[PDB]
């Protein structure tokens, strides 16, 4: 469960992302594809090379979903319900892969926001991304 301090930390750190939201999402995806090549097979209709407009556009979608989760952090199962259906049912995303993308999102935030990425905020962000991942893997059928 996310504590009051966790919610404060996540809102503050994500507040610093700003107009870079889509950019950071795209970078986290790229980090995932390069670091963990098994994850690439979910995107055969994507060119996954650097500067890919498709990865850029998908990074913005990932960021908008995370921003939605931050904005509705006390109601995340509801806010992310459609996305949960999508990832578990249609796409059949292996639950391990959420840990991989969550790690790459932390690395991206650390690389961009050195003042915000304190040990306490790192912990809050990890709990938040694990909570998002728990919702997105909640619908396997």
């Amino acid at each position: 469960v996310l504590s009051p301090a966790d919610k404060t930390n996540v809102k503050a750190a994500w507040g610093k992302v700003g107009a870079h939201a889509g950019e950071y999402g795209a970078e986290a995806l790229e980090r995932m594809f390069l670091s963990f090549p098994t994850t690439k097979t979910y995107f055969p209709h994507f060119d996954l090379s650097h500067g890919s407009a498709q990865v850029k556009g998908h990074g913005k979608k990932v960021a908008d979903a995370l921003t939605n989760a931050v904005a509705h952090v006390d109601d995340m199962p509801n806010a992310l319900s459609a996305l949960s259906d999508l990832h578990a049912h249609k796409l059949r995303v292996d639950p391990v892969n959420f840990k991989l993308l969550s790690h790459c999102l932390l690395v991206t935030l650390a690389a961009h926001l050195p003042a915000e990425f304190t040990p306490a905020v790192h912990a809050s962000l990890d709990k938040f991304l694990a909570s998002v991942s728990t919702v997105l893997t909640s619908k396997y059928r």
Partner: protein, 146 residues
């Protein structure tokens, strides 16, 4: 584990800029803060009540230096990680009984600390090379389990 020459280059170049007195304690401290069940193995280290307490703890900084030293030793023997980590494997698996998932976690926390310290220099391809490294170290440390 096999790194390309380009990856070896990226890894060794960055590692030369690492503060070896601080980065290990930062990784170990963040492990203890982010994954609090790992504190079970460090009761003798004293005050771990807050993140500030953990990060400023002299024992966490000193033990972190030994951990980093082991990572440094692994980087010098990428083609023989099993032999390099044999005694450490015996310690962490046979004596300590640490679940090997935590070896993966500490490696990923180290990657986060490198990203924190190096910023845009810790590029996605540099990260991918370091992920090969910390996976290799985790698998070698886990050898006594399998």
């Amino acid at each position: 584990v096999h790194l390309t020459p380009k990856e070896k280059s990226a890894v060794t170049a960055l590692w030369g800029k690492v503060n070896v007195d601080e980065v290990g304690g930062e990784a170990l401290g963040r492990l203890l803060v982010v994954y609090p069940w790992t504190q079970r193995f460090f009761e003798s280290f004293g005050d771990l009540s807050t993140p500030d307490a953990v990060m400023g703890n002299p024992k966490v900084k000193a033990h972190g230096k030994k951990v980093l030293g082991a990572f440094s030793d692994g980087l010098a023997h990428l083609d023989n990680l099993k032999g390099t980590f044999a005694t450490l494997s015996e310690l962490h698996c046979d004596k300590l009984h640490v679940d090997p998932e935590n070896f993966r976690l500490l490696g990923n926390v180290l990657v986060c600390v490198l990203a924190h310290h190096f910023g845009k220099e810790f590029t996605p391809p540099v990260q991918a090379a370091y992920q090969k490294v910390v996976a290799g170290v985790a698998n070698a440390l886990a050898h006594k389990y399998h």
